[PDB]
From a paper:
Another member of the expanded α-carboxysome locus is [name], a member of the [name]+ superfamily proteins (ATPases Associated with diverse cellular Activities), which are found across all kingdoms of life and fulfill a variety of functions, mostly involved in ATP-driven dissociation, unfolding and remodeling of macromolecules. We have determined the structure of [name], a [name]+ ATPase protein in its hexameric, nucleotide-bound form and show that it is an active ATPase. Our results implicate [name] as a component of the assembled carboxysome, where it is tightly associated with the shell.
Hexa-histidine-tagged H. nea [name] ([name]) was purified by affinity chromatography and crystallized with ATP in the mother liquor by vapor diffusion in sitting drops. One molecule of ADP is bound to each monomer, indicating that the ATP is hydrolyzed during crystallization. The two chains in the asymmetric unit align only moderately well (1.2 Å rmsd over all Cα atoms) with large differences observed in the C-terminal α-helices 8 and 9 (shifted by 3–4 Å) and with electron density for some loop regions missing in chain A. The differences observed could be explained by the inherent flexibility of the chains needed for the conformational changes coupled with ATP hydrolysis, which are typically transmitted to other proteins from [name]+ domain proteins. Structurally, [name] consists of the N-terminal P-loop NTPase domain (residues 1-175) characteristic of all [name]+ family proteins, comprising a beta sheet between two sets of α-helices. The C-terminal domain (residues 176–270), the [name]-specific portion of the primary structure, forms a five-helix bundle that extends from the NTPase domain. The [name] domain contributes only one residue, the conserved arginine finger residue R168, to the active site. Within the hexameric assembly, the majority of the [name]-specific domain is found on one surface of the hexamer, as a result this face of the hexamer is concave. This hexagonal profile of [name] is a result of the gaps in the hexamer formed by the NTPase domain being filled by the five-helix bundles of each protomer.
Author numbering:
A (entry chain A), C (entry chain A), E (entry chain A): 11 to 78, 90 to 152, 160 to 209, 218 to 267
B (entry chain B), D (entry chain B), F (entry chain B): 12 to 76, 90 to 151, 160 to 267
């Protein structure tokens, strides 16, 4: 596995490491595209552990999770980090399935199969939360508070991923900063990456910063005035 | 193999560089405005295979995931998923790991994980979707072409002379003017095409416009005659 | 196939013929029992083409349409006219299935089977619409505006189908005309057909014109006053 | 084989000619008023086989379509579909091509199309249905028979003397008077039957009427004693 | 089969016996735990007849009832008493399935199997109703009006089932009587049975009379004042 | 094999006699207050096998009914069904004949009826359920233990000294005070445990309390700093 590029905003990586070894289930909280998913993949490799990602949604059922085997069960048998992305989207009654894996009992009853699986001692559930869950689900997790990084830091992230000089990346950040009166950092990476293809700066921002997020016209010409301030 | 497409703006070059960065694109705009044909033109201009998916609700994970979306990932082909919003959401999130820096779709159950070809790109069409999904895309905004260009397209697609096409656009122009004033959506370019070809076959122009431009988009009688008023002035 | 009796009210039959040969999908719009279904069957035989009828409803799914093969697919392979009656009743997300058959692309992706079918060059979709659909579905169709025919004409239709003299048929029409302050022409055919069995004229109308349509009592004795005007 | 039926109106002759024209009939009216028994009497009087279908929601297309509805089409038998409104709607529309001038049900999947026998007729029962379906039927309106006739039926069905039957109808009469004033629906003839036969077996008439005429139709206590007041006057 | 202990409150047992032999379907109406289910089992054995109980619920379907064979069908073939407990809870469209068994026609169409079953001449449907059904379902049944028995009688029932002296049972009844400003008689049996285990009288009532029924705090200290009146 | 449990009240003796009468018990109270561990302690103290069921919605009749609930009936073991309300209702009513005087579960389809062992007991957990089901149970009301006892539990479970545990409880005390004033539910004992063990591993106590006591239960910022104020006073 190649190492995923994650730039630490604060002390979130040792808090996770501490939390991981300490048996406790982790919850990541923040807006869209603030590096939550990437953080997991960075910790998954840094701790030298397998990674299984689950894109949760409103139509996902329990048997999609445990099997008919399923991702959650596989993640339980082999020592893997099970990342339930977008936990809010999923039906909240399909998530109580993970409850036998989150407290001191660490097993998964596949009562359709008549089997009680072992939880590989190196197993942990991490979930993504933006920005509702049950209290019997919330209060079984430790929580990290993620957010869009400091302007200097985000500018470093954009330049590294999109492939543009600092001066352009700072402008993308300053535009984005005022744009969130959330707006994914990935959209800034897209914008810069387009500029790295000889695309008009405003057009690059129009494609990524004003069009994918809102279909309100007078919205756009409020964000396309702030793009014209810097670019 | 160039499919007929007339650019209204910088969409051809913007999508070009948009593909050069392998960025997931979203085509936004009204129905029948050239979105589905724009992809074909770019798939030809960028010189690469194209796989089209018509998204409905009875489209499970399996059929999207031997799977067409999986095929475009192997070959390195532009994957155009038309009308994504209609598809149930356990599909919309299937494309999520293909929108990451990873470039990878998980062929679970069946076996291995699939790392996509460097020439692969995912394209969707859009007028719901979550902000988690919308912000994974770059976006181009399509609207009905200006009278000059639109008439050229109609004339070419309908097989009618320039004069007839201009009048058809003129009718469509007077009808798009009425959105929020009686129409849920202005007149499509597709219906403009539909009209000229009835005319190109000898059908009375007033009748041809009635069954393609007036009737399909309106049930209200007093504003349907308003469109009929327009037709009787240009034809 | 025996020819279905269709009496032309105006220029709807050459407009369909013109529209058919011209690749465009047709939509029939009008009240219940104004001869929409019959018109299709008349055009189906007159153009010497196979006919597949689909009774759309709120519980009909896409796999009921394309197959698990289905009617729509069969209609696509062999050169047939696929008539989707009562298109408003069906779930509007199950109808976007026909979209790949209605524009210039003319195919049907059976992604459950891994097959892309050819559209037999003599294939067309016609739908029944009373009196909502998506704009992405509406604006792919040409539309004919059907309605209950002129009094003289409907009287001819009733006499031909029910089997009664003109004088009785005119009365059924005049009653119906004022009854629609819709009311199917078929109910008039039923009424006359009962009169052709030695049934009291008012009783024949009571069974067909006032009872099947409304369960409001004071409604009935408003329609049973107009039946007593003519009969 | 004549099943016991007493005509309240011209329903027997109206249905007779209604069948002679092979017209789809609908029986409208309250529950337990003789609708399901009227069909049997006519199926006997018109001298023809009869197939009855009890429509619920777990009645797919297959079970209606070797299928009973298909059987009546082959043989030429009156097909009585009881409580149509309860059935899911992909069934209600199965009968549509059998209500046309065609007289034909499509046995799709399995094979051929099925042209029905000239002696076939479809009958439904009704107190929802679309106007597209309701206007495919002729309709007869059933209501509870007038005191003279109703008592004769009760006496015959219950096996009680004329005097007892009249009082039971009298109780039912005073209860149908209260609809919109405390009762969702008046007292059925079926419950009137139920009462006499408890009485025909030696059960105290006040108790017999209580568990058949009062209790099954009312939960409200102060109007339940209102019905109990009626019972204690005739019994 | 051992005889179930049922104490007759009034003339409900001969009315059932009379109703049973007289072909008519029976309905039991009353609050929770007033001896409705027990009454059926008492009549089932006293009439020397097999008994099949069905716990109706909002997710129960028709095929759960008739088979895929099912309980209702089995109860129809062999001469058994089919007891549909909690009929209000079930989907009311899944219960019209029993309609062909409740009138003079006594059959069950398994149209999925292509079979019309005989109704064993000794077959009857009894249902539990607390305290809505369709009129086409209601008016096919005879109805018995059950209720919590007279204080003297209920005290006899508690002493017999729980195993406590009269004086304790009367107190449980008097507490319960005022508690229903329903409250199951079974909760009184539980309370006394706990007292028969050396449990504090108020604690025994707290576990059964104030805690299982309400989660309102100021409710509890209104019922725990009346428990302190007698105990 | 005694699992660590500290009694807050008479729950151990009340459940003891509650089992001696073979009465179905319900454990009521907030999440993470020791309900699931109380059963284990009693299953050990009463000297008998224990089968635990985690109830979700995709738990049909079959998996509850070779079935664990059936197993506890044969063996004579306490059957703890955790979070019953989450389970679909055709399961909640499966336990109904096991709550009667009969003591019997019907293994239908598969065959015979199953009479349970005299040592069998059914236990559920609860904070919906019908009154028909709730009144089939005896009930014990659990709440978070008083500061003395709670700190002892935290200290034991967290592996921290008495002083640290008391402060953690103090923080939890100041947070349970805020329910109805900004919090949907007070701080669990489980999160109190979670905090001490980060501290028992060298994590900064202010950070440890932040990610276990503050962050998991609050999204509102101005009252999240209110909890942060509390943390900065005790740590
Ligand atoms: N430390 C970081 N903070 C913020 N964004 C980052 C960081 N490191 C990488 N990114 C970029 O953010 C983009 C989106 O992050 P993502 O994993 O989608 O966040 P989320 O899971 O919260 O949506 C990635 O493409 C990545 O390049
Ligand atoms: N450059 C163009 N701009 C607009 N419309 C065009 C252009 N070229 C062709 N068309 C016509 O406009 C119609 C647009 O419909 P299509 O692109 O197939 O679906 P949609 O636009 O809804 O994705 C086509 O029928 C086509 O004949
Ligand atoms: N030209 C016509 N106009 C109106 N009604 C007609 C015509 N020709 C036949 N009919 C009669 O109308 C009846 C109902 O027509 P139908 O096909 O049900 O219309 P729809 O499909 O709009 O409900 C048929 O039984 C037919 O006999
Ligand atoms: N001519 C009649 N009119 C009214 N009721 C009758 C007549 N003949 C018999 N009955 C009795 O009335 C009851 C009507 O119920 P039934 O006809 O079976 O169901 P429904 O009337 O709801 O279709 C029957 O139980 C029958 O005993
Ligand atoms: N005659 C009676 N009246 C009231 N309760 C009784 C009677 N006989 C027994 N019981 C007790 O009532 C308890 C609950 O009765 P149950 O069958 O649950 O009533 P329901 O079916 O109305 O809920 C039983 O445990 C039984 O011991
Ligand atoms: N006697 C006790 N009272 C309260 N909490 C306890 C006790 N003993 C242990 N605990 C701790 O409290 C937590 C309670 O969670 P648990 O009992 O497993 O779930 P729940 O209480 O939600 O059923 C456990 O993690 C356990 O470490």
């Amino acid at each position: 596995r190649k190492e995923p590029y994650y730039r630490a905003v604060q002390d979130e990586i040792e808090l996770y490491r501490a939390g991981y070894e300490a048996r406790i289930p982790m919850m990541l909280k923040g807006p869209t595209g603030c590096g939550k998913s990437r953080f997991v993949e960075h910790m998954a490799w840094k701790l030298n552990r397998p990674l299984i990602t689950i894109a949760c949604n409103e139509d996902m059922t329990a048997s999609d999770l445990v099997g008919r085997d399923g991702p959650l069960t596989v993640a339980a048998r082999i020592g893997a980090i099970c990342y339930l992305d977008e936990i809010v989207e999923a039906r909240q009654d399909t998530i109580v399935v993970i409850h036998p894996l989150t407290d001191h009992r660490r097993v998964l009853p596949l009562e359709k199969k008549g089997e009680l699986v072992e939880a590989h001692p190196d197993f942990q559930i991490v979930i993504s939360y933006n920005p509702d869950l049950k209290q019997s689900t919330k209060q079984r997790f430790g929580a990290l508070d993620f957010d869009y990084p400091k302007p200097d830091i985000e500018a470093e992230i954009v330049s590294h991923e999109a492939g543009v000089d600092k001066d352009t990346a700072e402008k993308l950040v300053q535009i984005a900063q005022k744009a969130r009166n959330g707006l994914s950092t990935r959209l800034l990476v897209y914008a810069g990456k387009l500029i790295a293809k000889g695309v008009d700066a405003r057009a690059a921002c129009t494609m990524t910063l004003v069009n994918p997020i809102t279909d309100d016209v007078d919205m756009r010409d409020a964000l396309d005035t702030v793009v014209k301030t810097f670019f």
